[PDB]
Point group: C3
Chain length 201, copies 3
């Protein structure tokens, strides 16, 4: 009942930072190592980062890493890089969780899922995270996901299997914006499903 295994978080924006902070606080278990990959820096509009003391201009994943000082008994590594089909070498570990909103990320998300699964990682990603507050956050394997959701339809057409999707099913093309309470709820459910997948071994 000690930390075991490695989780890679691809995306450390408003959702991925929340999931990083949830995973870093797990005790009596959880991952022994967390890798967080994103090449973006803290901007004025990253209020959740700034309220925790991040400075404008800092890489988001360096701010995160800094919360794990010398005596921390799990390792947290911030990798300040944007993932393209050619730096997939940074993808490995036991669970790979991709958290970037929108449809502009789906080709890379699909490349990361394939690369991770062929190295034996379990994979998880989102199916829409928009919403004003009380929207149901649901969890589904890709083969049971609703084909009317364009993210599930695309991953199905790309032949993805054995892949967990989490979210509200509301997308950038729906009316709702992105709100902090919905991202807290998605991050809490993401964290639970990551732990279930880390139990796998």
């Amino acid at each position: 009942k000690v930390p075991h295994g490695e989780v890679t978080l691809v995306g450390a924006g408003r959702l991925g930072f929340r999931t990083a902070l949830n995973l870093m606080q797990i005790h009596r278990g959880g991952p022994e190592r967390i890798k967080v990959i994103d090449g973006q820096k803290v901007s004025a509009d990253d209020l959740i980062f700034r309220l925790m003391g991040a400075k404008i201009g800092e890489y988001k994943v360096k701010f995160i890493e800094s919360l794990a000082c010398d005596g921390f008994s799990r390792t947290v590594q911030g990798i300040p890089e944007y993932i393209t089909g050619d730096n997939l070498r940074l993808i490995g570990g036991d669970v790979v969780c991709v958290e970037i909103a929108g449809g502009d990320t789906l080709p890379i998300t699909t490349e990361i899922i394939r690369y991770a699964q062929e190295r034996g990682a379990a994979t998880i990603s989102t199916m829409g995270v928009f919403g004003i507050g009380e929207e149901d956050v649901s969890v589904v394997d890709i083969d049971e996901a609703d084909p009317e959701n364009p993210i599930a339809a695309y991953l199905q057409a790309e032949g993805i299997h054995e892949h967990v999707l989490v979210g509200t099913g509301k997308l950038i093309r729906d009316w709702e914006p992105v709100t902090p309470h919905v991202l807290d709820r998605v991050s809490e459910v993401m964290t639970a499903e990551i732990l279930k997948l880390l139990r796998g071994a």
Copy 2:
């Protein structure tokens, strides 16, 4: 999916500060301008402000405005005044949200609602925020409210219509105090309701 519209928050105490922080974190939507109006300063008992970096003696609205630096892509204006009949003219914009407490607040709430409706704003306020933690938070138009609630009964007797009320329906006369978990639930629901009224405009 960009910020649009103006919301005025009257009251920036334990509840209104949480609503302001929720709206300031909305992406891909939410208001373009937030005006927060309260005369009071941070005191030692305002622990939620102190835990987020506020200094005792700072006006509550100046602390909130200070989170919106020059690069922030919405405008947040802190007005360090209590609303009275003399400066009702500070109330403007598309949605006015009243979250005040302390002494006799129903008469000025009624005045703010009458004036904001004259100016064409949509209006929302609270119908009791007391509770020890798991009390249901409900949302009603005033003329559909549960007639046992004494805030709705007062505003109905003052001829208020077309007004949204959110709360637990526990009030100062009930035995329960004000707890932080109930305030977070109230502020999440108020935020979602504000977004619905901003759309409607």
Copy 3:
């Protein structure tokens, strides 16, 4: 509608610090005095403490007490000791809540309940706080608790009555770790239960 009564929190680790912070934030009621008793210092791994500005090496109860400065409307008495049979007289107040961190806590929890009851205090403790996110948190009197849970069975074997238990039912021996969202939910429910037991104080 002012603070009244005394709550003693035995344990100020990841769960007891959240319960202290909830009780410290209550407005228009709650306890007038909170006695927090723990002998432990903040370590690198106490991220929730460090994120709120605690320094490594500080006593957890003294960091907590430092939030209740001279202007604060309640007193917090941070007692930097562990409870043993030799210093049970430190337990006092109207409500005593045991949330002791580290495991192996049931013999001393039984002693604390017997002595608190002699003093006329109401008592509450946990029945398992492990969980990955959405586990039901339940509240039960010890004579109605399920004796298949080993904590309930032990305390029933030690002849404990008139004592509330709160938790998820998942223990150190189940697979699930301790996650921050489950500790938030357990502390929110414990805070509500403490305020019900405080009624009349």
